[PDB]
From Swiss-Prot, chain E:
Residue runs in coiled coils: 1-42
Gene: S
Outcome when changing residue 18 to K: In strain: Omicron/BA.1, Omicron/BA.2, Omicron/BA.2.12.1, Omicron/BA.2.75, Omicron/BA.4, Omicron/BA.5, Omicron/BQ.1.1, Omicron/XBB.1.5, Omicron/EG.5.1
Name the record gives this protein: Spike protein S2'
Record function comment: Subunit of the fusion protein that is processed upon entry into the host cell. Mediates fusion of the virion and cellular membranes by functioning as a class I viral fusion protein. Contains a viral fusion peptide that is unmasked after S2 cleavage. This cleavage can occur at the cell membrane by host TMPRSS2 or during endocytosis by host CSTL. In either case, this triggers an extensive and irreversible conformational change that leads to fusion of the viral envelope with the cellular cytoplasmic membrane, releasing viral genomic RNA into the host cell cytoplasm.
Full-protein positions shown: 952 to 1001 of 1273
Lineage, opening ranks: Viruses, Riboviria, Orthornavirae, Pisuviricota, Pisoniviricetes
Outcome when changing residue 30 to F: In strain: Omicron/BA.1
Length: 215, 148, 74, 160, 50
């Protein structure tokens, strides 16, 4: 099935405080009002980067696997939550042919009513995780609105990733190198954005570097 | 008239450098300060990754009989950083410690470990009479002397 | 190493040409004429300045020159 | 003899920090940035993942110390034009010097809204413009002769 | 008042521009390249800035 990205999938693109200000940037961002695939555990392409969103009631969604072949020929990212703790690893895993949870190694780590939004990209050898958690009250779609995912994790993997799968609704879209204009409040948080290629009004707002323009 | 000639600029009084708390040390204690060291026919190896590597402590410490760097100068190690690193550890006769260098020859350098002539790393040895040695002999330790 | 603004043991510690060198460098193998009389420096507290020389001496080693010896020829 | 080999990005040598100081010009570094500036306390609220903070035109103006979870204003280390106020050399070799915008300290001294003036006498009378300074101030060479600085006169006043 | 603020902001922004150099940050040409190479990069930033 397919649904709408709306104005979601913006995140803080660098570790920099900006406030009361309208900043232009180019990075792998979710294109505004693009179609996102909707799922109620297939292997998926990763492309240049993933936007992934999971909607929750009972802690159904535990994590993901990322890599290329995903069966011990080469290194492969595992990201999991089990019962009361997160586990992350990158080994040459002999994963199952179709993995699920009941009710050579080089890196390892251990620690609808809700929406949990994530962005993943691998650049210059580093895996970047950005995410946001919120309460929600919707079943059929992502709630139309805006928020920014803060970075949480920055891992020097260096392991080529071209595909991924989910571990157990959820929604998937793909990042693209589009220019975004980003509005920061006095507190230093991103409160709005303009996808500078969406429509000629967005082309105008990003040419003029303003969220609002005169006649 | 009034003229503009050059510019006043206060100069900096002192140099201040700042980094995080120096946590996430490499566990060199599991490699240099342990209760047990390896039999040379089957020497131990350990990963070094995701860590602050205190090479400074090793270089300035008095506990070593020989220490050398085999493709780098030992003063640089405290500023240097690496992709992946491995420790190896083992126990030898003093007349056969003389096989630990890049491209050297002998029964250990043929059949019990090998370093390239292009080897990169820091290599170290110390007396263990008080620790390893036994009044009858360390027959738990072996060399794979005869190997084709 | 014998060129303007180079780097390496000689260009740092034993024979340095300025960024503003002006001259010609002319060289040939002497394997057919040259011998551990020929020393060079391995260690120093800092780089020498362009066209510096020195007479303090452990920081030096001999070149392996013999008529048997291309990069290891004199 | 016991032996260890350490054969050679995630494995880095121990980076040394200096002790922190405030309200002085310093040659600073924090983690991955370097400069000349004054490190000072601030009321700014950066998000926990933010480490630098920025002005409107690309310039760092705040940082979060990597050991101390409070935000610093970084203020540029102070600077200004040095302007020399002189009568013509066919009069005298005395001069007064204007350190622009700086307020009389960082440098017979007179603070003005044009900057700190040094070597000119602040006179309570107003006079015409002879040498201009800015912000209503002029200066002139007058009698026991010296450079004097004062608020200039727009004219003789007249209730009609 | 807008144009005399905009030409200043434009001229400040041209400090971030690379002008064909390795980077626009002056310490990070110097603390990376040796002077024979660093001068050929800084001659770019000087020709650009000027
Ligand atoms: C709290 C809890 O159950 N934690 C378990 C952990 O002990 C186990 O090692 C891991 C295996 O991946 O799964 C999780
Ligand atoms: C990042 C980090 O570990 N910071 C600690 C700080 O919390 C503690 O108060 C201080 C004590 O001197 O040592 C350092
Ligand atoms: C107005 C005035 O002061 N003029 C004098 C001039 O008479 C004199 O000949 C000259 C000598 O350099 O210096 C000046
Ligand atoms: C995909 O996006 C276009 C607009 O670009 C829309 O017309 C189309 O119906 C969408 N397709 C699906 C299957 O959601
Ligand atoms: C690990 O990699 C080596 C080659 O570097 C290979 O020989 C070995 O079989 C691999 N191990 C596993 C568990 O696949
Ligand atoms: C990723 O792919 C490139 C080829 O495009 C290859 O050179 C590189 O070694 C690969 N990385 C890993 C970790 O296998
Ligand atoms: C910024 O955060 C403070 C709480 O620390 C809050 O009172 C204030 O309203 C917030 N500002 C904005 C613009 O949301
Ligand atoms: C090993 O432990 C000793 C304790 O006496 C200490 O002096 C030495 O620096 C330690 N070295 C490492 C690598 O831990
Ligand atoms: C600068 O001027 C202000 C008054 O505007 C004064 O309070 C401050 O102390 C002066 N600075 C110095 C260093 O004296
Ligand atoms: C100017 O006059 C006032 C009294 O009206 C006096 O307090 C002040 O010190 C005088 N200033 C100068 C520069 O003479």
């Amino acid at each position: 099935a397919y649904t709408n990205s709306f104005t979601r999938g913006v995140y803080y693109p660098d570790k920099v405080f900006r406030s009361s200000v309208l900043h232009s940037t180019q990075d792998l961002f979710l294109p505004f009002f693009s179609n996102v695939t909707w799922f109620h555990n297939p292997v998926l392409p990763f492309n240049d980067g993933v936007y992934f969103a999971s909607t929750e009631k009972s802690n159904i969604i535990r994590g993901w696997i990322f890599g290329t072949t995903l069966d011990s020929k080469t290194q492969s990212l595992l990201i999991v939550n089990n019962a009361t703790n997160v586990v992350i690893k990158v080994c040459e895993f002999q994963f199952c042919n179709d993995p699920f949870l009941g009710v050579n190694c080089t890196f390892e780590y251990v620690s609808f009513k809700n929406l949990r939004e994530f962005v993943f990209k691998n650049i210059d050898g580093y895996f970047k995780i950005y995410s946001k958690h919120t309460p929600i009250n919707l079943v059929r779609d992502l709630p139309q609105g805006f928020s920014a995912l803060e970075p949480l994790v920055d891992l020097p993997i260096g392991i080529n990733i071209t595909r991924f799968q989910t571990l157990l609704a959820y929604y998937v879209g793909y990042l693209q190198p589009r220019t975004f204009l980003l509005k920061y409040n006095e507190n230093g948080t991103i409160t709005d954005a303009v996808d500078c290629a969406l429509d000629p009004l967005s082309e105008t707002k990003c040419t003029l570097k303003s969220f609002t323009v005169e006649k | 008239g009034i003229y503009q000639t050059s510019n006043f600029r206060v100069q900096p009084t002192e140099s201040i450098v700042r980094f995080p708390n120096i946590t996430n040390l490499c566990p060199f204690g599991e490699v240099f300060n342990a209760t047990r060291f390896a039999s040379v026919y089957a020497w131990n190896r350990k990963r070094i990754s995701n860590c602050v590597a205190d090479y400074s402590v090793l270089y300035n410490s008095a506990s070593f009989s020989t220490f050398k760097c085999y493709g780098v100068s030992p003063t640089k190690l405290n500023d240097l950083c690496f992709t992946n690193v491995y420790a190896d550890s083992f126990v030898i006769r003093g007349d056969e410690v003389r096989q630990i260098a890049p491209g050297q020859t002998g029964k250990i350098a043929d059949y019990n470990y090998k370093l390239p002539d292009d080897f990169t790393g820091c290599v170290i040895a110390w007396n263990s009479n008080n620790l390893d040695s036994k009044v009858g002999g360390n027959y738990n330790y072996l060399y794979r002397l005869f190997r084709k | 190493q014998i060129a303007p603004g180079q780097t390496g043991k000689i260009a740092d510690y034993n024979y340095k040409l300025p960024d503003d060198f002006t001259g010609c460098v002319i060289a040939w193998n002497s394997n057919n004429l040259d011998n551990y009389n020929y020393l060079y420096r391995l260690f120093r507290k800092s780089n020498l300045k362009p066209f510096e020389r020195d007479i303090s001496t452990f920081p030096l080693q001999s070149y392996g020159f013999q008529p048997t010896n291309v990069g290891y020829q004199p | 003899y016991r032996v260890v080999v350490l054969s050679f990005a995630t494995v880095c040598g121990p980076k040394k920090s200096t002790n922190l100081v405030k309200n002085k010009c310093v040659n600073f570094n924090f983690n991955g940035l370097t400069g000349t500036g004054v490190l000072t306390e601030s009321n700014k609220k950066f998000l926990p993942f933010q480490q630098f903070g920025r002005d409107i035109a690309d310039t760092t103006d705040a940082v979060r110390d990597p050991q101390t979870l409070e935000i610093l204003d970084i203020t540029p280390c102070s600077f200004g034009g040095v302007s020399v106020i002189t009568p013509g050399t066919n009069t005298s070799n005395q001069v007064a010097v204007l350190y622009q915008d700086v307020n009389c300290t960082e440098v017979n001294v007179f603070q003005t809204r044009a900057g700190c003036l040094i070597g000119a006498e602040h006179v309570n009378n107003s006079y015409e413009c002879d040498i201009p300074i800015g912000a209503g101030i002029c200066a002139s060479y007058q009698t026991s002769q010296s450079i004097i600085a004062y608020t200039m006169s727009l004219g003789a006043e007249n209730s009609v | 008042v807008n144009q005399n603020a905009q030409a200043l902001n434009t001229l400040v922004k041209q400090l971030s521009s690379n002008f064909g150099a390795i980077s626009s940050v002056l310490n990070d040409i110097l603390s990376r390249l040796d002077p024979p190479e660093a001068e050929v990069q800084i001659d770019r930033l000087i020709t650009g800035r000027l």
